[PDB]
């Protein structure tokens, strides 16, 4: 899928997504969308989690670092979305953690894009007094031993 609506992602981005939201692979943000708004609890994650942090979390991104790194940079944002991010100071960085944020942040910036597209479809103006339904919240699936 062409990066209009997303950008550097290519279900690169997608897929982080649906690695935290626990949701099938997907082609585009209207797929990656399509789990989240018929999984309730996904949608919900969207719901709750702020768009930062709920591409920040596709990471692995420890949120202190995280914080830290983007309050040395500076961003170029384009339609509530990162177009362009850069670091104002790199000393910071210079712990592991916040380089290994920094020189991953690429993949942040595409999965944050692409979490930014899902509110924007989902919780933005699409009956945006609480999206278009919700009733598949309490029957959320409690899978035993989901995990492997």
Known sequence: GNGKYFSKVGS???????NKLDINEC???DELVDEINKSGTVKRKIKNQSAFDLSRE?????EADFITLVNNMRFKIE?????NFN????????????????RNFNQFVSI???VTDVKKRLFENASGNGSGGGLNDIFEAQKIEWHE
């Open 87 to 102: 670091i104002e100071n790199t000393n910071c960085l210079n712990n592991p953690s916040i380089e290994t944020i920094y």
């Open 12 to 18: 690169a981005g997608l897929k982080q997504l649906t």
């Open 79 to 83: 339609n509530c979305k990162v177009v």
């Open 27 to 29: 082609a585009t943000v």
């Open 58 to 62: 596709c990471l692995g991104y420890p």
């Open 112 to 114: 944050f894009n692409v």
